[PDB]
């Protein structure tokens, strides 16, 4: 029965991640929609039309978001961040907790820009994913130089309401991006392909999408609720000589495992290239 | 609640992974008391047989006892035992029984051929389910046989819906479902092991990497199930231009990721047909 | 107290006799072995070990209680004809020849005496250091003590368990051919150690020790091999980098391919036996 | 023998390797569990749970481990080493033998850090693996600038109680890491896949794991006990036209040998990359 009575949340950016989090927070009951405000330079986005139905306050002016908010999410593209922080930097107060979800934007770069206006800005770096929209996100966060102990606990409380959330060291966020940030896209790709396979073997497309999604959801839930190794759970499904062990062999023959390792690695490395442009 | 007060007796011929998964699921659902379940196995030293004991499921080495106890009888053995099994307990199948075959590839026609030699109208249902019934998130399909009453199919759907998704299909779809959701959880466990390796390669502790990858898959599956959206649209929606995610998608494409999962569904389906081509011939 | 014979005096005959005598279960002089080409190195090796040697297969039969068939499979028919009239009630015939079915042996021997006691066994060369992997299947007329006796004899030179005969082709692909896969892998690992600067001899020793220690860890753990893999792979470390390059090559699938190919070939040989 | 009467051993780090060595040492009889002390900054590790049950005295203060030890194993990740050498570098005494088991951490770098406190730190670099836990490890060590003759002898004796052990030049340690350090992980991968193959061909999983593990163990022991080349052993067991030579062909067709060469090389090269971060 969680609810933040004295918290006002702002989003700079009204893209997919801002909508997902606002929808998750409101569905979770931790935050009334009208105590949330978001700002975007494009008031004709599909997400902007959706936020208005929820009752989120919308404004085109970032300073308006900053002046309304206590917790301020930065959910914009990384190249705009230096211009955003210049724009609202003079408007950051002691009460503000700045939570950056911008891709590869480091705590150092945000604190350096904001400290030019006011010392000790309270900064938290967040890496979350879109399944927060169904309250099954995976979120990690790292606390900045000046964030109080209570700032991180508060952020963990809020982000726990929309999925898994834990604190990490900041130099793990690139790797988490490659795993759970990009993970949902890997799964959507897998689900489309599995459904194609279902259709090839004779299933209606709709049924094949449903079954494949249910299979993935159930397997993930099994693992989360098991203490056992994913290899052990795989062993339990694969009856000797059966259909499943035959299909696993053709996965192995294509290097299935290595493609997913490749993917995690490529997403993490790209995130570091973006962290470099942030720090350069 | 309705099924519970039916006070249904359930039997499993076969006490393996799937029998344990379903027994665990049904009891967790509250639809069945563990001691109203009976399971038989030719081998009592299995680990699944021991977990079944601890649950309080009744265990016996005698298939006839499982049959006589049961109202709904699950057949959960390898496809090549089924003719031996139906020969053994075919005389004991009563008009009141619903026979539910889970044995992969085994056709309704083959079961009814054996059982029709004893009672004339055996009630047979063919089922294809998976191991996540154990956490009540299974994916189940079933096809009703020649003599299954309309109420038999509804009862089956109600029972299997308590542990996951369940819907009726025509029987000629079941081998393809086997390739998709029957074998699906194993594809996912393989993917999760690999994603965790990738997380560990890039600096995460194994424990956290397992947790994050599993949470990622779960939330993405839930997202798809709750949206009317095409999975490619969801993929589009989350891949920002120039971003880390689209870079990772490219390397998946470059290895033919999609084709491997199609290959897998196809190989599992074809294998199931090969096992049915020894059930029939 | 028991007398053991070997029709055949090759790699598998020597490995078993060396294993048994090293184990203290059999005295070298209570073992006899027969061979045509009495000029194999393994023949001269059994000689130095104390095993009695004869060129006449019938003499081995007359000497033995338990009679191992360690010949190539194309020789089994020509052998069951030669000695089939010399099999007695007391004999346990243990076939180790590749893909030779219990059916084919009992059918040939039943033409001489009903109820021949036949056991089919699939073992491997590491019995020579008492770390073999053995499975056996009992025939139609094998008494209970026959299989119990077999398990006691073979357990002295490694792991041993009973299986249904229709699992033996798969076991061949796994533990029957497995030592060859490990020898190939050890040669390759040593090549990699030498490329990175190690002397060959140290590289062979280190690679073999690593494989021995890993195998023992798994046997002595209750844990899944993937779990042990997780335990050794430090985040960001050298091991997880090396596992990625194995995965990129389809390493796992090649070993699956191997077990499958060896099993399938064994089945092809069982076919020519069953005709 | 007398090397071990009244010897105390300490571990800084309670990860996988400190448990493996502690379990192996106590099972060997060379040390008593109570005479072993370990320091971990997080009692949440699963290994820290087991170490306590062994009777190994645990503590969070690394300085306590240093005070209580004669032979000091450093079993942490390589990037904490500069932090840990700064923490207890003043507590290193002439009596200490400092044994580094941190990946890629060079003797030069440890001696550089500790030479700023007392002038002649006794340092040994060690490369062991996890099968020390069943006393079948493969260990090599390199002796540093100030290690006495008895120091190498004592290390050899200690590590010989849990497996193979020999002295190498330090510049072979990266190559050994790639071979016997990563080796057990190659074997676990191979065993999982060999079991998958046995399962595909009809075997129960449990029997397939047992049989594959027994085959590998027996083959390795066979090679250790023969004077013969691994290729000659391969020849001896491959009968003409038989099942084994058919299986070897499909291994060759996938470049099986080259993958394992690739693996040793990749692990060695990564160790060199870590060695460079130790000297930067
Ligand atoms: O309900 C069922 C039937 C038995 C079954 C067998 C396999 C197999 O691997 O052969 C499977 F993948 C899924 C199932 N699920
Ligand atoms: O002694 C030691 C500690 C350093 C080390 C690191 C790895 C790794 O690659 O993660 C390894 F496999 C073995 C060792 N051996």
CSV table of C-alpha atoms in Angstrom, one decimal, chain A residues 56-198:
chain,number,residue,atom,x,y,z
A,56,UNK,CA,-0.6,13.9,-16.9
A,57,UNK,CA,0.0,17.7,-17.0
A,58,UNK,CA,1.6,18.6,-20.3
A,59,UNK,CA,3.6,21.7,-21.1
A,60,UNK,CA,6.1,22.7,-23.9
A,61,UNK,CA,8.4,24.5,-21.4
A,62,UNK,CA,11.1,22.5,-19.6
A,63,UNK,CA,11.4,25.3,-16.9
A,64,UNK,CA,7.7,24.6,-16.2
A,65,UNK,CA,8.4,21.0,-15.6
A,66,UNK,CA,11.4,21.8,-13.3
A,67,UNK,CA,9.4,24.3,-11.3
A,68,UNK,CA,6.5,21.8,-10.8
A,69,UNK,CA,8.7,18.8,-9.9
A,70,UNK,CA,10.6,17.3,-7.0
A,71,UNK,CA,11.8,14.2,-8.8
A,72,UNK,CA,12.9,15.2,-12.3
A,73,UNK,CA,13.4,12.4,-14.9
A,74,UNK,CA,15.5,13.2,-17.9
A,75,UNK,CA,14.1,11.0,-20.7
A,76,UNK,CA,15.5,12.6,-23.8
A,77,UNK,CA,18.2,11.7,-26.4
A,78,UNK,CA,21.7,12.1,-25.1
A,79,UNK,CA,22.7,14.8,-27.6
A,80,UNK,CA,20.1,17.2,-26.2
A,81,UNK,CA,21.1,16.7,-22.5
A,82,UNK,CA,23.9,19.4,-22.5
A,83,UNK,CA,21.4,21.9,-24.0
A,84,UNK,CA,18.7,20.8,-21.5
A,85,UNK,CA,20.9,21.2,-18.5
A,86,UNK,CA,22.0,24.6,-19.8
A,87,UNK,CA,18.3,25.6,-20.2
A,88,UNK,CA,17.1,24.5,-16.8
A,89,UNK,CA,20.4,24.6,-14.9
A,90,UNK,CA,19.6,27.9,-13.2
A,91,UNK,CA,16.2,26.4,-12.1
A,92,UNK,CA,17.6,23.4,-10.2
A,93,UNK,CA,16.9,23.8,-6.4
A,94,UNK,CA,18.1,21.9,-3.3
A,95,UNK,CA,14.8,19.9,-3.2
A,96,UNK,CA,15.4,18.5,-6.7
A,97,UNK,CA,16.5,14.9,-7.4
A,98,UNK,CA,17.6,14.7,-11.0
A,99,UNK,CA,17.2,11.1,-12.4
A,100,UNK,CA,18.9,10.7,-15.8
A,101,UNK,CA,17.6,8.0,-18.1
A,102,UNK,CA,19.4,9.5,-21.1
A,103,UNK,CA,21.5,6.9,-23.0
A,104,UNK,CA,25.1,6.7,-21.8
A,105,UNK,CA,25.0,10.1,-20.1
A,106,UNK,CA,27.3,9.8,-17.1
A,107,UNK,CA,26.8,11.2,-13.6
A,108,UNK,CA,30.0,13.2,-14.0
A,109,UNK,CA,28.8,15.1,-17.1
A,110,UNK,CA,25.5,16.0,-15.5
A,111,UNK,CA,27.0,17.1,-12.2
A,112,UNK,CA,29.7,19.1,-13.9
A,113,UNK,CA,27.1,21.1,-16.0
A,114,UNK,CA,24.7,21.5,-13.1
A,115,UNK,CA,27.4,22.5,-10.5
A,116,UNK,CA,28.1,25.6,-12.5
A,117,UNK,CA,24.7,26.9,-11.4
A,118,UNK,CA,24.4,25.5,-7.9
A,119,UNK,CA,26.8,23.3,-5.9
A,120,UNK,CA,25.8,19.8,-4.8
A,121,UNK,CA,23.1,18.8,-7.4
A,122,UNK,CA,21.5,15.6,-6.3
A,123,UNK,CA,21.9,13.2,-9.3
A,124,UNK,CA,20.8,9.6,-9.9
A,125,UNK,CA,21.6,7.7,-13.1
A,126,UNK,CA,18.9,5.2,-14.0
A,127,UNK,CA,18.8,2.4,-16.5
A,128,UNK,CA,15.3,1.0,-17.0
A,129,UNK,CA,13.2,-0.6,-19.8
A,130,UNK,CA,9.8,-0.3,-21.4
A,131,UNK,CA,8.1,-3.2,-19.6
A,132,UNK,CA,7.7,-0.8,-16.6
A,133,UNK,CA,4.5,0.0,-18.6
A,134,UNK,CA,3.1,-3.3,-17.4
A,135,UNK,CA,5.0,-3.1,-14.0
A,136,UNK,CA,7.5,-5.7,-15.0
A,137,UNK,CA,10.5,-3.5,-15.8
A,138,UNK,CA,14.0,-4.2,-14.8
A,139,UNK,CA,15.7,-1.1,-13.4
A,140,UNK,CA,19.1,-0.3,-12.0
A,141,UNK,CA,20.3,3.0,-10.6
A,142,UNK,CA,23.5,4.6,-9.4
A,143,UNK,CA,23.7,7.5,-6.9
A,144,UNK,CA,25.6,10.6,-7.6
A,145,UNK,CA,28.1,12.5,-5.4
A,146,UNK,CA,25.5,14.6,-3.6
A,147,UNK,CA,22.5,12.3,-3.5
A,148,UNK,CA,21.5,11.6,0.1
A,149,UNK,CA,21.0,8.0,1.4
A,150,UNK,CA,17.3,8.7,1.5
A,151,UNK,CA,17.4,9.8,-2.2
A,152,UNK,CA,18.4,6.4,-3.5
A,153,UNK,CA,16.0,4.6,-1.1
A,154,UNK,CA,13.2,6.8,-2.3
A,155,UNK,CA,14.1,6.1,-6.0
A,156,UNK,CA,14.3,2.4,-5.3
A,157,UNK,CA,10.9,2.5,-3.6
A,158,UNK,CA,9.4,4.3,-6.6
A,159,UNK,CA,11.0,2.2,-9.3
A,160,UNK,CA,10.3,-1.1,-7.4
A,161,UNK,CA,6.6,-0.3,-7.9
A,162,UNK,CA,7.0,-0.9,-11.7
A,163,UNK,CA,9.3,-3.9,-11.7
A,164,UNK,CA,12.6,-5.2,-10.4
A,165,UNK,CA,15.0,-2.4,-9.1
A,166,UNK,CA,18.4,-2.5,-7.4
A,167,UNK,CA,21.4,-0.2,-6.8
A,168,UNK,CA,24.5,-0.8,-8.9
A,169,UNK,CA,27.9,0.9,-9.3
A,170,UNK,CA,27.7,3.3,-12.2
A,171,UNK,CA,30.3,1.4,-14.3
A,172,UNK,CA,27.9,-1.5,-14.5
A,173,UNK,CA,25.1,0.5,-16.3
A,174,UNK,CA,26.6,-0.1,-19.8
A,175,UNK,CA,26.5,-3.8,-19.2
A,176,UNK,CA,23.0,-3.7,-17.8
A,177,UNK,CA,21.9,-1.7,-20.9
A,178,UNK,CA,23.2,-4.5,-23.1
A,179,UNK,CA,21.3,-7.1,-21.0
A,180,UNK,CA,18.0,-5.7,-19.6
A,181,UNK,CA,17.8,-2.4,-21.4
A,182,UNK,CA,18.0,-3.9,-24.9
A,183,UNK,CA,16.7,-7.3,-23.7
A,184,UNK,CA,13.0,-6.6,-24.5
A,185,UNK,CA,13.9,-5.9,-28.2
A,186,UNK,CA,15.8,-9.2,-28.3
A,187,UNK,CA,12.6,-10.9,-27.1
A,188,UNK,CA,10.3,-9.1,-29.5
A,189,UNK,CA,12.7,-10.3,-32.3
A,190,UNK,CA,12.6,-13.8,-30.9
A,191,UNK,CA,8.8,-13.8,-30.6
A,192,UNK,CA,8.3,-12.6,-34.2
A,193,UNK,CA,10.6,-15.4,-35.4
A,194,UNK,CA,9.0,-18.1,-33.2
A,195,UNK,CA,5.6,-17.0,-34.6
A,196,UNK,CA,7.0,-17.3,-38.1
A,197,UNK,CA,8.1,-20.8,-37.3
A,198,UNK,CA,4.7,-21.6,-35.8
